[PDB]
Design a protein around this ligand. Structure first.
Ligand code: KJK
Length: 359
């Protein structure tokens, strides 16, 4: 006896709204798409000092959810014949030819199995020449392809090679090719001056206003900004890839293909993948310190899950993101905040909402 849009708003109020007070978060956007119908819920302020309300135009930093766009770009290049995932980086970045890193193939870079690449570049690697020197100085540790360690330099180098194969800077690969193909008109690597008024402040742990700073290969690792409507469209594209031209369709499907497992988690291209229904602990394990911060030996996929779900967390110093979608339920959810909150809370809140929505 209650309209569906009110039912979903109530669920988001019950499970996401309390996080605002609990973590002193200034602003939040939550969206649900179910059976091609979109539901948008905005809370709080995109700028505290300006008393500017979060709304459909608010631009948030996606953090590592940006890696999903990097993976789509690589899937696009691969299916256009510009790269093979068996290639090594020196085929495209010629100065890496005959260096040790040129023994690692593009899939291994994209899925974090070089065997010796940490979460971040060293603090002092900043310039283009310093990034090149860092990879020229790279030497193997663990056997290549056997150990997963979540790594910005790893997928950053993949993104750089994808851009080289397409004869464009990476920011242009997204803003001129991939965002238009996905129908995203309010998504940016670099937010233009004409849109800065819509760029939220992020807020650090002292609730001080901040925004992301430049860093090495930032764009492919964590450098996309977007709005809730654009992120719901992105979820829509992942739920309905057969509604895009052949090259973009195949690119999206590329990001859904599991490549190896670490226990219950399947590493796809950018996306993390799970058998569905997934237990809460399966989803929480994917965010454990053991999985996120340490190397873990990988194993071949044994059960290729017919029914599955995908998710990805992302953070910058001042923003939190979570995206999740379940193809066979034709449903997905996006959470954007301009303050970080624990990944476990994002996963729990989305799990409660998605399981409670009437089918
Ligand atoms: B990305 O968001 O993935 C990620 C997660 C996750 O998946 O939620 C958790 C913890 C770290 C990471 C790394 C990715 N995000 C960043 O790289 C953050 C970025 C790093 C450079 C800046 N350096 C300032 C250090 N105070 C901070 C923002």
């Amino acid at each position: 006896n209650t309209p569906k849009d009110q039912e979903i708003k109530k669920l988001v109020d019950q499970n996401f709204k309390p996080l605002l007070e609990k973590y002193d978060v200034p602003g939040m956007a939550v969206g649900v798409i179910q059976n091609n119908k979109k539901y948008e819920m905005y809370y709080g302020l995109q700028s505290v000092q300006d008393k500017k309300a979060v709304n459909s135009s608010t631009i948030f930093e996606l953090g590592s959810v940006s890696k999903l766009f990097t993976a789509t770009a690589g899937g696009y290049a691969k299916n256009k014949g510009k790269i093979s995932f068996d290639d090594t980086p020196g085929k495209y970045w010629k100065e890496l030819k005959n260096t040790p890193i040129d023994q690692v193939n593009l899939l291994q870079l994209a899925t974090y199995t070089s065997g010796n690449l940490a979460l971040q570049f060293p603090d002092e690697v900043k310039t283009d020449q310093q990034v090149l020197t860092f990879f020229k100085d790279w030497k193997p540790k663990n056997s290549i392809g056997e150990y997963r360690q979540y790594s910005n330099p790893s997928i950053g180098l993949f993104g750089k090679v994808v851009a080289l194969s397409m004869n464009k800077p990476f920011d242009q690969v997204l803003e001129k090719t991939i965002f238009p193909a996905l129908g995203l008109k309010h998504s940016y690597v670099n937010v233009p001056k004409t849109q800065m008024q819509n760029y939220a402040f992020g807020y650090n742990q002292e609730n001080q206003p901040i925004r992301v700073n430049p860093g090495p290969l930032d764009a492919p690792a964590y450098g996309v900004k977007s709005t809730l409507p654009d992120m719901l469209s992105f979820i829509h594209a992942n739920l309905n890839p057969q509604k895009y031209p052949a090259d973009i369709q195949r690119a999206i499907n590329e990001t859904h293909q599991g490549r190896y497992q670490v226990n219950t988690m399947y590493q796809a291209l950018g996306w993390e993948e799970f058998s569905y229904p997934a237990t809460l602990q399966t989803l929480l394990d994917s965010n454990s310190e053991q999985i996120v911060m340490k190397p873990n030996k990988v194993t071949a996929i044994s059960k290729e899950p017919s029914v599955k779900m995908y998710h990805k967390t992302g953070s910058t110093t001042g923003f939190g993101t979570y995206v999740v979608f379940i193809p066979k339920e034709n449903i997905g959810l996006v959470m954007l905040t301009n303050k970080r909150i624990p990944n476990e809370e994002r996963i729990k809140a989305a799990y409660a909402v998605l399981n409670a929505i009437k089918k």
